[PDB]
Design a protein around this ligand. Sequence first.
Ligand SMILES: [Cu+2]
Length: 99
Amino acid sequence: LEVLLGSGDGSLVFVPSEFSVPSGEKIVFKNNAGFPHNVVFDEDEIPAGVDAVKISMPEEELLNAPGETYVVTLDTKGTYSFYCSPHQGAGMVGKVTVN
Ligand SMILES: [Cu+2]
């Protein structure tokens, strides 16, 4: 599924934020507006089988320019919560449900 990082109008929201995807879905995250951004998964709020490092964009790096994309394949079923580190405090979080 294609997720827009920012609802165009600069607002620091993942579009969608809370959602569902089938097992093995290839999620794509694109810098729409309100960048810089990244997609880090909450190490607790993920199915243990998939270590966070396998789904989280390394904190060291970030989608700094507009248009830049990130991609991740969520194999195992479960609830995967994620956030944009530089805007975590601003509520730029989400929750994807691998059905
Ligand atoms: Cu952000």
